[PDB]
Amino acid sequence: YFQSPPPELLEIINEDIAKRTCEEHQLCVVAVLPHILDTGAAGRNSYLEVLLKLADKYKKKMWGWLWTEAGAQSELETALGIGGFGYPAMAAINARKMKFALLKGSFSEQGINEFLRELSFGRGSTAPVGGGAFPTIVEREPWDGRDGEL
């Protein structure tokens, strides 16, 4: 009975989802996946499946889990220094101290796990979120799960 609720992996479809997720968890993991036309559904689901597995592995940390598409939240990318080294990219935000760390290993189960493990041990490099405030978040329709158009 005395177990915390299941993880949730939420697409960043509006500011309330993003800000509440980061304010209600000590750390929030933000994945910026490639545009759907780069991966299609199969490639996007490969990345989402990695996030879902690690969210379960780390469920006792009670972290938040967010994902978005390249270019869909440009101001968020800028505030996290994302966009210049391609996609996928990952940041972990500490909302309380308004700081973040970027994944520097592979966007894979092994690479993200090493990233998260360092964070669970609280021994990784951080930087202030750009401007010292939570970035503006734009409203987006949720991904329909298909391969995009074009």
Author numbering: 270 to 419
Quote from the publication.
Here we report the discovery of a multichaperone condensate in the ER lumen, which is formed around the chaperone PDIA6 during protein folding homeostasis. PDIs contain one or more catalytically active thioredoxin-like domains, which can reduce, oxidize or isomerize disulfide bonds in client proteins via a characteristic CXXC motif. PDIA6 consists of two catalytically active thioredoxin-like domains, domains a0 and a, which are followed by the inactive domain b of unknown function. The PDIA6 condensates recruit further chaperones—Hsp70 BiP, J-domain protein ERdj3, disulfide isomerase PDIA1 and Hsp90 Grp94—which constitute some of the essential components of the early folding machinery.
